[PDB]
Amino acid sequence: PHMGALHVVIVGGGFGGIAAASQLQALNVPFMLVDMKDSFHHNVAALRASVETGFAKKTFISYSVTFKDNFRQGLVVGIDLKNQMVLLQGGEALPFSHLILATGSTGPFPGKFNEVSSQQAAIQAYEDMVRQVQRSRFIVVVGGGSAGVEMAAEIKTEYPEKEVTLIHSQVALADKELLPSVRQEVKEILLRKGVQLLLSERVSNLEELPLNEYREYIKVQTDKGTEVATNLVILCTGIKINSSAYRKAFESRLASSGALRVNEHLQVEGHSNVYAIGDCADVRTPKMAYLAGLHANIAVANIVNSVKQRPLQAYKPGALTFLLSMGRNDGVGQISGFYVGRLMVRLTKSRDLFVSTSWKTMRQSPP
Numbered sequence: 386p387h388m389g390a391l392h393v394v395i396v397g398g399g400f401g402g403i404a405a406a407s408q409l410q411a412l413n414v415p416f417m418l419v420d421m422k423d424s425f426h427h428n429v430a431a432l433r434a435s436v437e438t439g440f441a442k443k444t445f446i447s448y449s450v451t452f453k454d455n456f457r458q459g460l461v462v463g464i465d466l467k468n469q470m471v472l473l474q475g476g477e478a479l480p481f482s483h484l485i486l487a488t489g490s491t492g493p494f495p496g497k498f499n500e501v502s503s504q505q506a507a508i509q510a511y512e513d514m515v516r517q518v519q520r521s522r523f524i525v526v527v528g529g530g531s532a533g534v535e536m537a538a539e540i541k542t543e544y545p546e547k548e549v550t551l552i553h554s555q556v557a558l559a560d561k562e563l564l565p566s567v568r569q570e571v572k573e574i575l576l577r578k579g580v581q582l583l584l585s586e587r588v589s590n591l592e593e594l595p596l597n598e599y600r601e602y603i604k605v606q607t608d609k610g611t612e613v614a615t616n617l618v619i620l621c622t623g624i625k626i627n628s629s630a631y632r633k634a635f636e637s638r639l640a641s642s643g644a645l646r647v648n649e650h651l652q653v654e655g656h657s658n659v660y661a662i663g664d665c666a667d668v669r670t671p672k673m674a675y676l677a678g679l680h681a682n683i684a685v686a687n688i689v690n691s692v693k694q695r696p697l698q699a700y701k702p703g704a705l706t707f708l709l710s711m712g713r714n715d716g717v718g719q720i721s722g723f724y725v726g727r728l729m730v731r732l733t734k735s736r737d738l739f740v741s742t743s744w745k746t747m748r749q750s751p752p
């Protein structure tokens with residue numbers, strides 16, 4: 386029993402979780418941030434950290450340095466809604482007056498990294514990836530969504546002498562929600578960089594392929610019988626909302642996508658003190674780091690507003706903002722529903738990939 390006192394538990398230390406923890410910390414509200422890793426991952430820059438020697442150490446930020454005893458490393462395995470408890474692997478339990486679920490998404494390395502690991506092992510995993518790319522003259526990227534087009538562009542921009550093939554199962558590249566003008570310009574930039582495109586083809590022997598590892602010879606096969614020989618295979622084949630921590634407890638509340646249904650105040654439907662933020666929230670908006678941060682501000686604010694019997698803040702989407710870096714010198718996208726060009730995207734995203742914003746939030750300086 387908390388007897389009216391606040392204790393907020395945040396499950397997930399991604400873009401959403403560190404924003405929520407930073408604000409609760411500034412408000413002196415008791416809270417615990419739980420993450421399976423020992424450091425925040427600026428995963429927007431994970432593909433650049435896969436091609437540039439020495440960059441990976443700019444993409445991982447120690448939780449304990451920023452949050453100290455308000456941070457607990459661990460894997461959440463269930464939520465006990467009756468006794469308001471966050472269940473950790475190992476048996477430990479965390480009581481909460483309010484729960485913020487910020488579990489993000491999972492997917493293949495290198496675009497996502499969700500291993501229980503130390504900070505130096507995580508950085509080394511990306512430095513090893515750089516070494517695999519450097520050893521490999523021929524490289525195949527599988528999947529031409531927004532991650533795969535960025536991956537292929539990063540490789541050919543850093544290493545123009547390598548041979549890069551992107552294999553994609555659809556006719557057009559990147560997200561279907563994007564303006565057709567954006568999707569066509571993505572294709573043209575890749576072709577001008579020398580990336581070979583194999584569109585409307587599905588790689589069919591994924592079980593048989595060594596992944597993220599240089600080999601003298603790998604044969605990639607497609608459902609149409611195309612065969613590509615390569616030294617290296619990288620999967621950018623998509624992500625899944627990470628519902629492990631909460632799927633059982635909230636099964637009745639889950640969208641199809643695995644997200645949690647929520648109102649414009651981001652409380653989970655059926656609950657007044659549970660919030661979902663970021664990728665695991667059924668925003669129906671695109672899953673974006675910057676939206677996770679905005680959701681966190683809304684979530685923390687209505688926890689406080691709700692204790693002050695005040696009216697709640699509301700999340701209202703606008704047109705789609707979506708920026709694709711195409712290596713450090715190029716890119717294309719849209720800012721709230723209109724096309725923005727290559728100079729704009731290069732300056733806004735491609736050069737720095739928003740890395741400095743996470744170090745600022747965490748109040749740390751990059752090594």
Ligand SMILES: Cc1cc2c(nc3c(=O)[nH]c(=O)nc-3n2C[C@H](O)[C@H](O)[C@H](O)COP(=O)(O)OP(=O)(O)OC[C@H]2O[C@@H](n3cnc4c(N)ncnc43)[C@H](O)[C@@H]2O)c(O)c1C
Nearest residue numbers: 397399400401421461488489490630663664672673674675
């Ligand atoms: C891959 C990629 C993504 C981009 C990219 N670009 C942009 C961009 O330009 N702008 C943007 O806003 N988003 C961009 N994104 C999307 C952005 O990465 C995601 O939308 C963002 O990470 C979502 O933030 P969340 O806070 O919702 O989730 P995270 O995945 O960041 O963090 C979740 C955390 O929960 C932890 N966790 C999950 N389940 C757990 C459990 N059961 N126990 C403990 N910890 C758990 C995970 O380990 C992880 O640390 C991009 O170029 C690439 C290549």
Ligand SMILES: NC(=O)C1=CN([C@@H]2O[C@H](COP(=O)(O)OP(=O)(O)OC[C@H]3O[C@@H](n4cnc5c(N)ncnc54)[C@H](OP(=O)(O)O)[C@@H]3O)[C@@H](O)[C@H]2O)C=CC1
Nearest residue numbers: 528529530531532552553554587588622623624672708709
């Ligand atoms: N710049 C940004 O803001 C970025 C944002 N994101 C976010 O992350 C989300 C996921 O993006 P992404 O990670 O690119 O995942 P996506 O699911 O968007 O793209 C993955 C693609 O890979 C294709 N694919 C899967 N298996 C194969 C195969 N065996 N052979 C060939 N093609 C295959 C899929 O086609 P099928 O589905 O037909 O199998 C799909 O079109 C985005 O929706 C966005 O919210 C990610 C990267 C950049």
